[PDB]
Amino acid sequence: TGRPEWIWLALGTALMGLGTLYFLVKGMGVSDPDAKKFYAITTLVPAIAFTMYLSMLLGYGLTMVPFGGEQNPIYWARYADWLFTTPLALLDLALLVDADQGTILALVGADGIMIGTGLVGALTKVYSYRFVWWAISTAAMLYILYVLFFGFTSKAESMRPEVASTFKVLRNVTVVLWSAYPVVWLIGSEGAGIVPLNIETLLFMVLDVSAKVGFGLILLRSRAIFG
Amino acid sequence: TGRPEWIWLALGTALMGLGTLYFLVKGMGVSDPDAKKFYAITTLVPAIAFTMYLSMLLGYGLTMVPFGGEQNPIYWARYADWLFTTPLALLDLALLVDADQGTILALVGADGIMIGTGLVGALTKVYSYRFVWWAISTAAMLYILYVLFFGFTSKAESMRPEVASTFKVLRNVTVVLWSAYPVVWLIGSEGAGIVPLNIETLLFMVLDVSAKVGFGLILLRSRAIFG
Amino acid sequence: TGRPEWIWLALGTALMGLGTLYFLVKGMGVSDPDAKKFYAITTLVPAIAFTMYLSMLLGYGLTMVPFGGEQNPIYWARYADWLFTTPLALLDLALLVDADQGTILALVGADGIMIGTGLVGALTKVYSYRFVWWAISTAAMLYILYVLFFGFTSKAESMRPEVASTFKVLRNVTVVLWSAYPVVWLIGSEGAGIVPLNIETLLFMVLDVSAKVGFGLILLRSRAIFG
Numbered sequence: 001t002g003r004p005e006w007i008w009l010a011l012g013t014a015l016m017g018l019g020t021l022y023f024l025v026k027g028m029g030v031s032d033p034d035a036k037k038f039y040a041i042t043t044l045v046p047a048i049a050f051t052m053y054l055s056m057l058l059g060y061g062l063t064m065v066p067f068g069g070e071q072n073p074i075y076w077a078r079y080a081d082w083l084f085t086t087p088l089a090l091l092d093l094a095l096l097v098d099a100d101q102g103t104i105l106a107l108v109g110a111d112g113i114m115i116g117t118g119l120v121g122a123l124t125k126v127y128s129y130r131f132v133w134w135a136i137s138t139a140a141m142l143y144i145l146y147v148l149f150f151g152f153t154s155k156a157e158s159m160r161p162e163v164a165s166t167f168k169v170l171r172n173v174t175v176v177l178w179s180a181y182p183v184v185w186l187i188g189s190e191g192a193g194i195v196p197l198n199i200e201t202l203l204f205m206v207l208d209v210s211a212k213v214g215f216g217l218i219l220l221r222s223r224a225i226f227g
Numbered sequence: 228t229g230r231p232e233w234i235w236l237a238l239g240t241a242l243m244g245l246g247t248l249y250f251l252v253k254g255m256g257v258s259d260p261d262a263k264k265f266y267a268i269t270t271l272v273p274a275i276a277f278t279m280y281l282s283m284l285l286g287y288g289l290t291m292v293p294f295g296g297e298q299n300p301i302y303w304a305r306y307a308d309w310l311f312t313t314p315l316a317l318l319d320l321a322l323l324v325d326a327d328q329g330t331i332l333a334l335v336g337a338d339g340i341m342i343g344t345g346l347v348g349a350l351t352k353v354y355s356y357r358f359v360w361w362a363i364s365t366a367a368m369l370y371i372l373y374v375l376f377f378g379f380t381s382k383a384e385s386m387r388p389e390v391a392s393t394f395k396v397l398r399n400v401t402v403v404l405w406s407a408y409p410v411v412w413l414i415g416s417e418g419a420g421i422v423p424l425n426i427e428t429l430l431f432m433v434l435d436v437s438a439k440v441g442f443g444l445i446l447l448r449s450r451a452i453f454g
Numbered sequence: 455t456g457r458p459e460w461i462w463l464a465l466g467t468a469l470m471g472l473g474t475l476y477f478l479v480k481g482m483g484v485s486d487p488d489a490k491k492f493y494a495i496t497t498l499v500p501a502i503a504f505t506m507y508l509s510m511l512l513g514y515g516l517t518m519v520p521f522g523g524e525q526n527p528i529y530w531a532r533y534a535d536w537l538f539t540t541p542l543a544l545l546d547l548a549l550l551v552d553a554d555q556g557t558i559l560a561l562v563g564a565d566g567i568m569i570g571t572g573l574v575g576a577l578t579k580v581y582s583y584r585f586v587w588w589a590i591s592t593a594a595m596l597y598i599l600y601v602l603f604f605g606f607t608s609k610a611e612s613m614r615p616e617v618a619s620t621f622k623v624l625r626n627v628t629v630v631l632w633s634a635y636p637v638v639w640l641i642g643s644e645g646a647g648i649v650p651l652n653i654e655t656l657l658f659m660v661l662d663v664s665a666k667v668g669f670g671l672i673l674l675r676s677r678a679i680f681g
């Protein structure tokens with residue numbers, strides 16, 4: 001406890017945790033080699049989100065950064081979580097659409113830069129600089145979203161209707177959800193202090209649980225994952 | 228020198244080093260594309276263990292963590308070593324058994340969580356919390372071992388007898404050896420101080436050399452690695 | 455500004471940045487699945503070099519290390535950059551030559567050790583030790599270069615002449631360029647202070663831009679990347 005946002009963290013820890021248990025149980029005895037990958041990728045996302053949120057609740061994933069003439073509390077664990085989970089979500093989309101290795105590598109590369117560059121931004125002591133990294137990170141994201149919206153859709157159009165429509169849903173959700181992140185970051189205590197850490201944490205929480213549990217639900221409950 | 232455990236560290240450095248030289252020399256001119264992978268994975272394990280142990284001997288891989296109302300010496304390099312070496316050992320087992328990519332990804336994912344979560348546990352300042360991470364890490368391990376014992380055996384049963392029996396041996400050794408780690412950690416200066424750092428280091432040393440040099444010996448000296 | 459080497463850093467940031475824009479634009483609408491990988495790998499190298507150089511210019515990728523009875527400025531970001539970019543360059547060479555997965559894994563493994571071990575060397579407080587890690591790192595490099603010069607050439611000899619000769623060029627450039635790194639490091643402020651940080655930074659700059667932009671140019675402007 002202590003920190004006023006501890007509650008959104010513990011709630012997030014709980015949801016990632018149960019979300020994992022459920023996906024695990026649901027994938028129990030699934031032999032389809034293709035479904036397995038989908039289950040392994042999707043189940044690993046919340047499992048990681050769980051460990052990271054718990055680190056924020058317990059205090060480990062929290063550090064202090066001086067900028068703006070003050071010591072600001074920065075949750076680095078969010079980045080460590082995203083670093084490993086965004087690529088997996090990208091893999092799910094790639095497997096569903098049967099993307100070229102070349103484009104998978106670019107997206108993954110684009111993603112690592114986005115999170116890494118975003119983490120650098122969060123830990124920068126010169127207020128003004130935080131926004132530069134936020135722009136480099138956001139540009140990287142637009143590149144990923146641009147390719148997922150156009151390139152992948154075109155790819156999904158060659159799969160059977162169940163796959164095509166499930167991808168469309170997953171596609172619309174990732175574009176909307178992902179674009180919300182740089183916004184919250186910009187208005188939260190890491191960029192402009194237009195919003196308090198308390199709210200900043202609640203937003204990322206809902207944004208995080210939707211992207212990892214919801215996304216998993218949408219995909220795993222469709223037949224789209226079966227060869 | 229200095230630290231009373233320097234000797235187990237230097238001895239470990241020596242053994243990882245010679246273990247690498249030997250595996251390297253032994254793999255010299257091997258054309259079998261399958262044997263090569265086995266040699267590349269197995270030879271890389273001690274090569275990494277070498278660099279990490281040397282970092283502990285020289286002092287770099289040693290840090291201090293306050294918990295229990297004291298500054299405890301923590302060898303983080305052990306974790307950095309394990310982070311990269313456990314996945315490789317898992318790859319060896321997977322290649323021997325011809326595991327599904329989906330299960331390879333889950334194990335690797337399970338493994339990163341195990342070591343990462345274990346490293347977080349080692350660096351936590353709130354004594355009580357160290358044990359929580361130890362449980363999350365140990366649960367992750369049981370998942371890996373459960374899948375390697377049942378899932379893989381079943382897989383090996385479809386390979387020729389040389390492969391089947393070599394896997395059985397490797398399987399029995401990893402289960403026994405791996406389960407020893409969380410125990411040493413629990414009774415060592417990182418959990419309950421039932422045992423001194425001096426002994427704690429000697430145990431991990433023997434546990435480490437057996438798992439990386441011994442395991443490599445067992446596998447590399449069998450015909451099991453040949454297509 | 456401030457640091458006397460800021461200029462070589464900003465110039466490097468600019469060149470990596472433009473080098474990326476150009477490779478991106480050049481790869482615009484390329485359908486050849488093989489060419490795409492080549493473009494994705496090659497374009498990602500400078501994109502990462504860009505983010506890292508910018509971190510050095512802005513000051514983030516700069517830290518201070520005490521050794522020799524003084525606080526020496528150490529640019530860790532160089533290592534973080536190399537950690538991700540050398541493996542990619544290795545992948546390009548591997549794809550051009552169609553290397554065995556086993557050898558790809560060994561080189562990548564050899565490379566991570568080289569950079570990691572080199573980073574450890576840069577951050578070591580005991581002057582004398584810095585040179586030990588420099589030797590372990592350099593040995594790792596010789597292993598990579600030895601395999602790229604002999605093993606790969608032999609491999610390229612089985613491809614069509616355009617591929618064979620482009621590889622020869624790329625091969626000669628990586629051997630010469632890569633061997634220059636441990637030298638600059640040895641004579642620069644990180645090893646023997648025979649050369650000032652100012653020059654040390656200018657050399658790595660030219661060495662870096664040549665290896666990432668030049669290399670990319672040579673490869674991407676040849677037909678060698680087409681199946």
Ligand SMILES: CC(C)CCC[C@@H](C)CCC[C@@H](C)CCC[C@@H](C)CCOC[C@@H](CO[C@H]1O[C@H](CO)[C@@H](O)[C@H](O)[C@H]1O[C@H]1O[C@H](CO[C@@H]2O[C@H](CO)[C@H](O)[C@H](OS(=O)(=O)O)[C@H]2O)[C@@H](O)[C@H](O)[C@@H]1O)OCC[C@H](C)CCC[C@H](C)CCC[C@H](C)CCCC(C)C
Pocket residue numbers: 063064065066083105108109111112113115116117119120123125502505513514515516517518530533534537538541542573577
């Ligand atoms: C697997 C996955 C896909 C990839 C994951 C990336 C991961 C593996 C690696 C990163 C690389 C690593 C090997 C390099 C680490 C070296 C290590 C020694 C340095 C670590 O520090 C870097 C951290 C920053 O730490 C900072 O935050 C903490 C917590 O808040 C602080 O405690 C710490 O001090 C901070 O350090 C920064 O500030 C220091 C400031 O010190 C002093 O501070 C005072 C005021 O307090 C004054 O300002 C002083 O100034 S003065 O008075 O002296 O003048 C000032 O000195 C600095 O000294 C430090 O240097 C530092 O700025 O951040 C890590 C950031 C990220 C992870 C790195 C960049 C990653 C890049 C974007 C990745 C692209 C990867 C992509 C995935 C490619 C995939 C390719 C495939 C193969 C295809």
Ligand SMILES: CC(C)CCC[C@@H](C)CCC[C@@H](C)CCC[C@@H](C)CCOC[C@@H](CO[C@H]1O[C@H](CO)[C@@H](O)[C@H](O)[C@H]1O[C@H]1O[C@H](CO[C@@H]2O[C@H](CO)[C@H](O)[C@H](OS(=O)(=O)O)[C@H]2O)[C@@H](O)[C@H](O)[C@@H]1O)OCC[C@H](C)CCC[C@H](C)CCC[C@H](C)CCCC(C)C
Pocket residue numbers: 048051059060061062063064076079080083084087088119123290291292293310332335336338339340342343344346347350352
């Ligand atoms: C490639 C491989 C498979 C993956 C490898 C993972 C690797 C790449 C990445 C980790 C991610 C990275 C990008 C984020 C780094 C950000 C960086 C700025 C922070 C680094 O710190 C994190 C370290 C902890 O450092 C701590 O230990 C050192 C050494 O002992 C200390 O010097 C340092 O200070 C410590 O920092 C902790 O404590 C700080 C405390 O500061 C103050 O301390 C005082 C007392 O001393 C008081 O307690 C103060 O309190 S108060 O008074 O102010 O109130 C207190 O503030 C904190 O401030 C710090 O925040 C911190 O708690 O640990 C890193 C841990 C691990 C590596 C991260 C979690 C990883 C997760 C389990 C990985 C799953 C990966 C799996 C492999 C997925 C694979 C997916 C595939 C694609 C399929």
Ligand SMILES: CC(C)CCC[C@@H](C)CCC[C@@H](C)CCC[C@@H](C)CCOC[C@@H](CO[C@H]1O[C@H](CO)[C@@H](O)[C@H](O)[C@H]1O[C@H]1O[C@H](CO[C@@H]2O[C@H](CO)[C@H](O)[C@H](OS(=O)(=O)O)[C@H]2O)[C@@H](O)[C@H](O)[C@@H]1O)OCC[C@H](C)CCC[C@H](C)CCC[C@H](C)CCCC(C)C
Pocket residue numbers: 275278286287288289290291303306307310311314315346350517518519520537559562563565566567569570571573574577579
């Ligand atoms: C994805 C890619 C391919 C792989 C990338 C590797 C990356 C993911 C992971 C590294 C692993 C990580 C999980 C472990 C991190 C734990 C963390 C808590 C520790 C981090 O510290 C390690 C840093 C060093 O930080 C140091 O530099 C900064 C900046 O300058 C300092 O601020 C910091 O303090 C430094 O810490 C060192 O010094 C400390 C000293 O403290 C005190 O200092 C005073 C003087 O100032 C006195 O000397 C004190 O002495 S005394 O008085 O008390 O007696 C002294 O205590 C120490 O306490 C610290 O312990 C430390 O020495 O470095 C990270 C180095 C590298 C990245 C790790 C080794 C990596 C290895 C070679 C990798 C092989 C990988 C290969 C790629 C395999 C691929 C396999 C495939 C699956 C096939």
Ligand SMILES: *C\C=C(C)/C=C/C=C(C)/C=C/C1=C(C)CCCC1(C)C
Pocket residue numbers: 081082085086089114115118119134137138139141177178179181182185208211212
């Ligand atoms: C954990 C699940 C998901 C879907 C995480 C997504 C995170 C992002 C898209 C983060 C993007 C960032 C940008 C674009 C710039 C500001 C820094 C961020 C890392 C928050």
Ligand SMILES: *C\C=C(C)/C=C/C=C(C)/C=C/C1=C(C)CCCC1(C)C
Pocket residue numbers: 308309312313316341342345346361364365366368404405406408409412435438439
């Ligand atoms: C380097 C070679 C091997 C086989 C290393 C294995 C390490 C483990 C199985 C470590 C497990 C841990 C657990 C289960 C919980 C406590 C923290 C540890 C990381 C020690």
Ligand SMILES: *C\C=C(C)/C=C/C=C(C)/C=C/C1=C(C)CCCC1(C)C
Pocket residue numbers: 535536539540543568569572573588591592593595631632633635636639662665666
């Ligand atoms: C970013 C582009 C390239 C080609 C980087 C190459 C870097 C090296 C070959 C670095 C080698 C090192 C050695 C051999 C020993 C000293 C420490 C270094 C990391 C500089």
Ligand SMILES: CCCCCCCCS[C@@H]1O[C@H](CO)[C@@H](O)[C@H](O)[C@H]1O
Pocket residue numbers: 023024026027028029030031035036039040041043044047329330331333334336337340366367370374
């Ligand atoms: C704390 C560790 C959490 C690890 C989570 C791993 C995600 C595992 S998904 C699981 O993977 C199996 C392969 O092993 C498939 O056969 C199953 O169908 C699938 O559901």
Ligand SMILES: CCCCCCCCS[C@@H]1O[C@H](CO)[C@@H](O)[C@H](O)[C@H]1O
Pocket residue numbers: 250251253254255256257258262263266267268270271274556557558560561563564567593594597601
């Ligand atoms: C310090 C750097 C240590 C690097 C260790 C790399 C392990 C290399 S194993 C070696 O890989 C070759 C492919 O290159 C195979 O052809 C050989 O049969 C096999 O034995």
Ligand SMILES: CCCCCCCCS[C@@H]1O[C@H](CO)[C@@H](O)[C@H](O)[C@H]1O
Pocket residue numbers: 102103104106107109110113139140143147477478480481482483484485489490493494495497498501
């Ligand atoms: C800041 C983020 C920078 C990201 C850089 C990614 C490198 C992308 S190369 C690009 O990849 C496409 C697949 O997506 C191929 O179809 C194109 O032919 C090729 O040119």
